[PDB]
Write a protein that binds this ligand. Structure first.
Ligand SMILES: CCC(CC)CN(C[C@@H](O)[C@H](Cc1ccccc1)NC(=O)O[C@H]1CO[C@H]2OCC[C@H]21)S(=O)(=O)c1ccc2ncsc2c1
Lengths: 99, 99
């Protein structure tokens, strides 16, 4: 679809078999989801945002469907203010900016 | 134009008679720019993201040119690690997400 930006670009995602709402965030290199249970192994990592750095759990090679489009990639889980879909997955679903 | 997301979507902007580089950021409600000494009045504000909040100065009705597209709106100035063009201005240049 073509998404205008008068509202937040929020979409429904499926991860670990569960539906959630997430923000399509072209300013995020990485995908960061709020605290949740995910199966598989993970590794502790640090990511920095506008206000500093937080601790996250890095899950690699996770299946995630974004607005009906499948991706498989890295998902960081931690105290982000909102679920964000970053460029690592936006590229997989073929997302571009256009003006 | 069409911008892919393999790399950060950085573009040149013109603001306050200065040229700078900023991200086209669909996850940013507002526009947040590096410290610069703009003229005129301003209101204090706090904006939150990964890692917490930063304190910024809110300037209204600021003229900004983004890839030769003109806009006018609110700009927040403060110790942000990256210049971000937010939805308040992206809507004005006709920017959409597409997949
Ligand atoms: C609440 C949703 C997100 C936070 C998640 C908001 N951010 C915009 C993001 O695009 C931010 C913009 C950004 C980019 C780079 C440094 C600092 C901020 N990117 C970001 O934090 O990405 C992180 C995840 O991937 C990593 O790649 C970049 C940093 C990592 S922000 O910078 O904190 C921001 C911008 C305008 C704004 N107006 C009101 S609140 C508010 C918050």
């Amino acid at each position: 679809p073509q998404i205008t930006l008068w509202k937040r670009p929020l979409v429904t995602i499926k991860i670990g078999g569960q539906l959630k709402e997430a923000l399509l965030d072209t300013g995020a290199d990485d995908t960061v989801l709020e605290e949740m249970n995910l199966p598989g192994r993970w590794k502790p990592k640090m990511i920095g945002g506008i206000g500093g750095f937080i601790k996250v759990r890095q899950y690699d090679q996770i299946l995630i469907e974004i607005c009906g489009h499948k991706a498989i990639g890295t998902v960081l889980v931690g105290p982000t203010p909102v679920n964000v879909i970053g460029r690592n997955l936006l590229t997989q679903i073929g997302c571009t900016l256009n003006f």
